[PDB]
Enzyme design. Structure first.
Site, short mmCIF file in Angstrom:
data_model
loop_
_atom_site.label_atom_id
_atom_site.label_comp_id
_atom_site.label_asym_id
_atom_site.label_seq_id
_atom_site.Cartn_x
_atom_site.Cartn_y
_atom_site.Cartn_z
CE1 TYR B 110 7.86 11.91 33.57
CE2 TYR B 110 8.17 13.91 34.23
CZ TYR B 110 7.24 13.24 33.62
OH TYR B 110 6.12 13.62 32.93
CB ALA B 162 0.08 15.29 33.59
CD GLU B 163 5.13 16.75 31.95
OE1 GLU B 163 4.59 17.71 31.78
OE2 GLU B 163 5.81 16.15 32.99
CB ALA B 164 -0.39 16.57 26.45
CG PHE B 167 4.01 22.14 28.85
CD1 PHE B 167 4.03 23.43 29.00
CD2 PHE B 167 4.27 21.19 29.57
CE1 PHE B 167 4.74 23.89 30.14
CE2 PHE B 167 5.03 21.34 30.78
CZ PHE B 167 5.10 22.91 31.10
#
Lengths: 69, 264, 69, 69, 69, 69
Positions: B110, B162-164, B167
């Site tokens: 990031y 990927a984040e969703a 999480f």
């Protein structure tokens, strides 16, 4: 003071003389403020990103002010 | 070896996200409430076909993001129109059947993506619009370099994919726009804490609360409304051996790393 | 100073004479700097690998330099 | 100093005379070394097993040596 | 001293004057002891239950005894 | 002292003159107390919410008093 290296604390070393040496990035810098000692291990222990700000920006340069993000 | 992500509705979306977790990770009855369970992941790659950015039309369909099973690394994006897979510089040897490869000048961190796109995740907005926009800049990318335009767009898709995926708290807050999301700082901390949560969570045994770094859960239900999927402990995303271990005290589970840092 | 031992922290010992003792490896050295006491226990707690530096590189040997990794 | 009690800290207590009490095992000793205060609260919080080596090994005993494991 | 309040530390105020208030239970009690404030911020920071024993048991009350669970 | 800004700490930075800077809210304020240095550093590490009362509630304001919630 200008920015020197930003990054994660690679390794910290407590010196004979009571100065603290850090390797953040490709530089190995040191400080004689007895206060950064544990602020700097904490940072390393938890994997924080630290910007160290300095004019002696090189292996052996020493530092006084860091940003802890 | 290719799942779909239909962004049509907030339902089409979550429904798909469930298809992939159910598909790549098995539950833990140790962490369960209301019939939801924490799933732990368990190497290879797989495609995910992005689809539904303007359901009326149905035009924006040649985006396909290649994803790595064990760590949910987004190794890069394939261009179904020409079948060129553009991989991030840290995945210079990764390959996907049926495509040619072309290596981007920046890696996937990031740190970099935020450097180049010139934006910070904390506060990043995302809606149908930006996602449509973001699809075009990717689609029109030809070339080697990781430009500011591919950067900003990968920040966005890596986030809703990927984040969703990992999480439950980021899917939920994002789902809504589909029926403008602002990525809070609280959502950012979480992403940064994926590997230490995954080392600890398995130790959950009915403690009043769980605390890893700058994140705390007040009950099993709070663990569930935020975290859907964890690592099982292509560099690993888990912390090393003997190091991070959950330490329980007074019905509170901690990650040994954070207690070591706050006790001196 | 040269390296002596390197490893994880076996156990630490607060002594009668106010010194602190560490067992890193097969060696069991000690130190007379107060600041180290906190550092050494967080290193032990969290599992870091420390490298001790001294010429007293033997049991009961004393030390003032450390590398926290 | 002989070993005297071994186990994980039950409760720690700061007293009115500025001495610090530790209940480990069924012994309930105390110490008057300031540096031990912090360290013991940390061993107690982390569930370490401690061995207290004392000669006054009985409730009310006084200690000074601890091994943190 | 009779135990006065028991629970977790709801909050602490580090004041200018270097007086130091804590709220445990339904009471805001202060203390001036050497190191006690420090040991109490770690109890707050990590979540320990503590009991403050005292006969000045009421807001504005002072305390010097504290058990740490 | 009036409340100035309540919230979690975003970053801290140790300056050259030895004062610690904290950013909480939309303000960056600083302090001369060397003890906070580390409780502030820990509030940051664990996502704690804190209020900062100061009469100099503007950027660069100094503070002496904190309440850890």
């Amino acid at each position: 003071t200008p920015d020197c290296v930003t990054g994660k604390v690679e390794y910290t070393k407590y010196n004979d003389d009571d100065t603290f040496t850090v390797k953040v990035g490709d530089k190995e810098l040191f400080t004689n403020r007895w206060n950064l000692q544990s602020l700097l291990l904490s940072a390393q222990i938890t994997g924080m990103t630290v910007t160290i700000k300095t004019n002696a920006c090189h292996n052996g340069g020493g530092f006084s002010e860091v940003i802890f993000r | 070896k290719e799942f779909t992500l239909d962004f049509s509705t907030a339902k089409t979306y979550v429904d798909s996200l469930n298809v992939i977790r159910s598909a790549i990770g098995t539950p833990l009855q140790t962490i369960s409430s209301g019939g939801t369970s924490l799933l732990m992941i368990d190497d290879n790659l797989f495609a995910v076909d992005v689809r539904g950015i303007d359901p009326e039309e149905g035009r924006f369909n040649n985006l396909r993001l290649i994803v790595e099973r064990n760590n949910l690394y987004v190794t890069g994006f394939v261009n179904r129109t020409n079948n060129v897979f553009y991989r991030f510089a840290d995945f210079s040897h990764v390959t996907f059947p049926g495509t040619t490869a072309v290596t981007l000048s920046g890696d996937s961190s990031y740190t970099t993506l935020q450097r180049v796109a010139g934006i910070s995740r904390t506060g990043m907005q995302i809606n149908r619009h930006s996602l449509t926009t973001s699809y075009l800049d990717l689609m029109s990318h030809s070339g080697t370099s990781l430009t500011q335009s591919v950067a900003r767009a990968m920040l966005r898709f890596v986030t809703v994919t990927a984040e969703a995926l990992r999480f439950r708290q980021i899917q939920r807050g994002f789902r809504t726009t589909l029926d403008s999301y602002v990525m809070t700082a609280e959502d950012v901390d979480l992403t940064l804490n994926w590997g230490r949560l995954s080392s600890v969570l398995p130790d959950y045994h009915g403690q009043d609360s769980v605390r890893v770094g700058r994140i705390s859960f007040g009950s099993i239900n709070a663990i569930l409304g935020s975290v859907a999927l964890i690592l099982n402990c292509f560099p690993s995303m888990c912390p090393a051996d003997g190091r991070v271990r959950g330490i329980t005290h007074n019905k509170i589970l901690w990650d040994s790393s954070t207690l070591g840092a706050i006790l001196m």
